[PDB]
């Protein structure tokens, strides 16, 4: 289906514990493929998926210096934003940045993004037109004007509609055999009595990729939206994901509940009944 490439940057000041820490990770869909950690020993951008390794050494040279450049800029921004907000140097603060591009099932540009947070809250973000900005508060407006003055949006728009989609398409092709796979969920049900009159039914989705999935419980065909415990989709550790939905039912009435599993690797959605 559709596809995305996304980079996530985190810069954390740690007064009294050294210089700021910078961590960058790059994803294609739900697959991480690069990593940069300022505390790590290599001081290099590193592969994290087998297919990115077929880039030549000039790739890793160029990636390493651009990532390093962003952390450098983040260090400046940690000091600057502290000014905007009149915060003392004794405090830890965090700048986060996420950007990337989406392509359709045919590799065509769909959307570009770039958003920045400070201390976990929206700071400034690029609008969908990829030419205007939206400042979250008063301090970010100072940045907005700085970035209007420097035509940052046009640098950013040229990247998002240019290199970003180009290398996203490229990575999709070179990693076709894992990135364009779908592993459908392996499903099963568990069942445990809680009392003499109630029991838990738990509906399991294991080993699936991509992470997007929907599990819904129904009773006699009616969504049980409110009474279901649903956990966040979680990584198995091997590139796939897991999720479950559970519901407490009257003991003896299990046959009225159905678990419905929708995932793009499933030709048709699954229905499970105890």
């Amino acid at each position: 289906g559709s596809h995305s490439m996304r980079y996530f940057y985190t810069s954390v000041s740690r007064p009294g514990r050294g210089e700021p820490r910078f961590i960058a990770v790059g994803y294609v869909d739900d697959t991480q493929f690069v990593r940069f950690d300022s505390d790590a020993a290599s001081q290099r951008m590193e592969p994290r998926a087998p297919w990115i390794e077929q880039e030549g050494p000039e790739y890793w040279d160029q990636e390493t210096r651009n990532v390093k450049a962003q952390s450098q800029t983040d260090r400046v921004d940690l000091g600057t934003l502290r000014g905007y907000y009149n915060q003392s140097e004794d405090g830890s603060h965090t700048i986060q940045i996420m950007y990337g591009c989406d392509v359709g099932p045919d590799g065509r540009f769909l959307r570009g993004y770039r958003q920045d947070a400070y201390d976990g809250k929206d700071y400034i973000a690029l609008n969908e037109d990829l030419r205007s900005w939206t400042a979250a508060d008063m301090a970010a407006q100072i940045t907005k004007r700085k970035w209007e003055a420097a035509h940052a949006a046009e640098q950013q728009r040229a990247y998002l509609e240019g290199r970003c989609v180009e290398w996203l398409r490229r990575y999709l092709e070179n990693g076709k055999e894992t990135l364009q796979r779908t592993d459908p969920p392996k499903t099963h049900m568990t069942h445990h009595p809680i009392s003499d009159h109630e029991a838990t039914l738990r509906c399991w989705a294991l080993g699936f990729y991509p992470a997007e999935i929907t599990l819904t419980w129904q009773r006699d065909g009616e969504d049980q939206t409110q009474d279901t415990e649903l956990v966040e989709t979680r990584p198995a550790g091997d590139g796939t994901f897991q999720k479950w939905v559970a519901v407490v039912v009257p003991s003896g009435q299990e046959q009225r509940y159905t678990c419905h599993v929708q995932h793009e690797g499933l030709p048709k959605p699954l229905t499970l009944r105890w």
Binding site: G26, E63, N66, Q70, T73, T143, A150, A152
Partner: peptide, 9 residues
């Protein structure tokens, strides 16, 4: 591939 030199906040 990552983006190039950002401006500065």
């Amino acid at each position: 591939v990552v983006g190039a030199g950002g401006v500065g906040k």
